[PDB]
Amino acid sequence: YDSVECPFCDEVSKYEKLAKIGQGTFGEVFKARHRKTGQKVALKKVLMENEKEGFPITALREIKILQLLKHENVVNLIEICRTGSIYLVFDFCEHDLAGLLSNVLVKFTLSEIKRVMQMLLNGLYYIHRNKILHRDMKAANVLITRDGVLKLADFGLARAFSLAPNRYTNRVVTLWYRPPELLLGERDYGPPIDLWGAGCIMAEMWTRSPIMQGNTEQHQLALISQLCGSITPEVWPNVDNYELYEKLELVKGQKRKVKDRLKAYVRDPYALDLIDKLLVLDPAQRIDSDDALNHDFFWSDPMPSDLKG
Amino acid sequence: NNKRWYFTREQLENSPSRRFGVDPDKELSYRQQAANLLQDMGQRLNVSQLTINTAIVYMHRFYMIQSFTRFPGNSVAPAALFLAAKVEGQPKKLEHVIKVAHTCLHPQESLPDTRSEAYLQQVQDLVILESIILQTLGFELTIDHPHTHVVKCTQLVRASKDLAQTSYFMATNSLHLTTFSLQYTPPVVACVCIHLACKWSNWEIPVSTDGKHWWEYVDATVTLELLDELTHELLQILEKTPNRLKRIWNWR
Numbered sequence: 001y002d003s004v005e006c007p008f009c010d011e012v013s014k015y016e017k018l019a020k021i022g023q024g025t026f027g028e029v030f031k032a033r034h035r036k037t038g039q040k041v042a043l044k045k046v047l048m049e050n051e052k053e054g055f056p057i058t059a060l061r062e063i064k065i066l067q068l069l070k071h072e073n074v075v076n077l078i079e080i081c082r083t084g085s086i087y088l089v090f091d092f093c094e095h096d097l098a099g100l101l102s103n104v105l106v107k108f109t110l111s112e113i114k115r116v117m118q119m120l121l122n123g124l125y126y127i128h129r130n131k132i133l134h135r136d137m138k139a140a141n142v143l144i145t146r147d148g149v150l151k152l153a154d155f156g157l158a159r160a161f162s163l164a165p166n167r168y169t170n171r172v173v174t175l176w177y178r179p180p181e182l183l184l185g186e187r188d189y190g191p192p193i194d195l196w197g198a199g200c201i202m203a204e205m206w207t208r209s210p211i212m213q214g215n216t217e218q219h220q221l222a223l224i225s226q227l228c229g230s231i232t233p234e235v236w237p238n239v240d241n242y243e244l245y246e247k248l249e250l251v252k253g254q255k256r257k258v259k260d261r262l263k264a265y266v267r268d269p270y271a272l273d274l275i276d277k278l279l280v281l282d283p284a285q286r287i288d289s290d291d292a293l294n295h296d297f298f299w300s301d302p303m304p305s306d307l308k309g
Numbered sequence: 310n311n312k313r314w315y316f317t318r319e320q321l322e323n324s325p326s327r328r329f330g331v332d333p334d335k336e337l338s339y340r341q342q343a344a345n346l347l348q349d350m351g352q353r354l355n356v357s358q359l360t361i362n363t364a365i366v367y368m369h370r371f372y373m374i375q376s377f378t379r380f381p382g383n384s385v386a387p388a389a390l391f392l393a394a395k396v397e398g399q400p401k402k403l404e405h406v407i408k409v410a411h412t413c414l415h416p417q418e419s420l421p422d423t424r425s426e427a428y429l430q431q432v433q434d435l436v437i438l439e440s441i442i443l444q445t446l447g448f449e450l451t452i453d454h455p456h457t458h459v460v461k462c463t464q465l466v467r468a469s470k471d472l473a474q475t476s477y478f479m480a481t482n483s484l485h486l487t488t489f490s491l492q493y494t495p496p497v498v499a500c501v502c503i504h505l506a507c508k509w510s511n512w513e514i515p516v517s518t519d520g521k522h523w524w525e526y527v528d529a530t531v532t533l534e535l536l537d538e539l540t541h542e543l544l545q546i547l548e549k550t551p552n553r554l555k556r557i558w559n560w561r
């Protein structure tokens with residue numbers, strides 16, 4: 001009944017709610033305004049539905065990760081607020097890439113698209129450097145500030161990784177941006193899976209729509225083979241030892257049409273070459289965050305440009 | 310802040326508990342007890358010492374904000390351990406933790422029916438308390454693991470397994486028995502434990518080829534004056550702890 005001390009956890013009432021930004025009845029995510037400074041923020045309530053084990057361990061993980069990740073291209077957790085209910089408070093970001101790509105009016109120059117991809121890849125390089133896998137790459141999880149700075153967002157499915165043989169969770173990542181490794185049942189993966197996601201997003205910068213929209217995992221794996229060729233120990237050395245390799249009904253006459261199928265939407269040869277190196281089948285031969293930033297795509301005309309426009 | 314959870318001796322004197330009439334002495338005991346309870350439960354729940362330590366630190370910090378007069382250790386400890394286990398990726402089931410707490414605190418008492426009102430109540434009581442912990446610590450649960458430091462330390466000094474074992478021993482006890490973790494950074498505490506371990510086992514670390522003492526390579530702030538003062542304090546309380554020293558005493 002008596003009130004108790006809490007110097008380090010403010011009541012969320014300091015913020016004034018404005019409008020449910022997620023709009024997908026997901027997260028209980030609100031835009032808000034600090035009642036004193038007018039500072040805009042995003043509030044995510046910590047879902048307590050069917051929490052039988054106290055504070056959700058998944059929340060704890062995400063919180064651990066947001067606190068660790070402090071970087072210009074990564075969403076910023078300002079603080080956690082109380083009320084019983086709990087809210088993650090973020091710096092508000094005006095736009096998010098998914099919305100911009102779907103908006104017919106919005107239009108990117110090659111120079112600006114370069115900048116976006118540059119910031120995004122930088123973000124990945126940073127989070128991986130810090131032993132974190134994002135595990136949910138998709139345009140929707142990529143925000144851009146009113147000042148044109150890209151922020152990687154939504155670390156709810158992220159997790160720390162390391163060297164040891166690892167046993168990680170398999171059904172991570174939205175279906176359309178999920179990489180081959182996972183769909184073949186791999187549980188000892190790493191940063192290469194986020195790069196695959198970066199690939200689908202890069203291509204999405206011109207197609208304005210997710211390139212590979214499968215209904216089921218075999219359906220998705222079909223689409224991928226009908227873009228990057230089919231899984232061969234020749235193309236992907238050692239795919240064999242995965243139990244589901246032909247046991248997932250896969251074609252055999254598929255030859256990579258990444259550059260052909262997208263030739264249309266993307267003109268610039270460098271852009272296509274980079275996409276091609278991101279959407280590689282074998283995770284071990286898939287280009288990494290560092291090499292990507294080195295790619296001539298970022299060092300040719302038009303050079304990458306800021307984008308307040 | 311970086312120095313939010315580090316306190317001066319004067320701040321330690323003026324603890325929340327002191328404000329409710331608790332002697333400096335009693336408070337220190339209340340802490341040591343909680344730490345024992347955490348150790349006992351953690352061993353039975355079969356979690357790591359890392360996790361037990363993490364819980365102990367939460368406890369120490371929790372009581373720089375809250376009073377023992379309002380929150381008994383016998384309550385905070387199980388909640389803190391429950392939490393620590395989750396944070397360190399050794400999650401233990403709520404029922405399981407409540408079960409072990411019960412038998413540690415009431416070895417004779419009869420386990421209640423997990424259907425009773427009285428049990429359903431204490432389940433929610435623990436959850437409630439975990440929450441009061443999270444809010445008191447301001448959701449800052451990443452601890453800097455002191456052992457990792459001792460290892461690197463004893464190593465970049467080339468000590469026998471024995472010397473090393475003993476230093477780890479010193480570290481673990483400094484956590485149960487002192488509030489060093491509330492005053493000094495893990496790297497410093499690590500030096501203190503190595504210093505005392507050397508003193509205890511007559512080992513003498515030769516000055517580096519320069520003339521600089523080993524600890525200067527571990528932390529620039531550290532001085533021989535400080536190390537001697539802190540090892541003396543730690544050794545004093547070690548001498549008050551029945552059988553504790555027997556564990557590292559050379560019986561041969």
Ligand SMILES: CNc1nc(C)c(-c2nc(Nc3cccc(S(N)(=O)=O)c3)ncc2C#N)s1
Pocket residue numbers: 021022026027029042043044075076090091092093094095096099143153154
């Ligand atoms: C559902 N996933 C997300 N969680 C958080 C916390 C998100 C977030 N979103 C924004 N801005 C934003 C997101 C979607 C749509 C729009 S808009 N322009 O109003 O339609 C703005 N800023 C920060 C965060 C964070 N963290 S998104």
